[PDB]
Amino acid sequence: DMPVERILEAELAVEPDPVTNICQAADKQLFTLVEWAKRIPHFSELPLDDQVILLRAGWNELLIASFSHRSIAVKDGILLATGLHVHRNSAHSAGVGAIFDRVLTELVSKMRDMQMDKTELGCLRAIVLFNPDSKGLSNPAEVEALREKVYASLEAYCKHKYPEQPGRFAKLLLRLPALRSIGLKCLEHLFFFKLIGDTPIDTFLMEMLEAP
């Protein structure tokens, strides 16, 4: 089964110019993200090749959702795992204001307004991790079955913790399209920074951007 307790432990086990600071922190969190994934139930039992495919497919959305939830109490800014607050004025003045505002409006503010807890965040990240549409998986059905168990557990958790909010489970799932769209746009920026070549991109972040 897929108990939300274990998913919550995985989140708590990994708790801690602007473009350069964000790219450096991203490389640091990629190491932490592997440790998180190995604590998600049944992920390590998957074929090694598929664990790679899932992490290469979801790392961007997984880590974007992480810092978004970490930034709840931050006003008009985000909090990186290194402890650095990046304010939206800094992002605008570095040329990435539009996508930064998208994170604040579509992700951080929505997480703040509903008070998304760390169990719901973990389940949402687990759903993203267990992405059955990832190309090249040796068995898409197994990953789809794992995703179904996660959101069967998360719905039951929502209905128990927040009985007064019937649409809350659906509200959580309906932030994934925004997360998908924002992840893709952030990838486009990274590839541009790489192309220009004056932004420090460390080895692990660089490996995520290379071809399969």
Partner: peptide
Amino acid sequence: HKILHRLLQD
């Protein structure tokens, strides 16, 4: 992908 394989092997 050297790094990801090595960390998942542990």
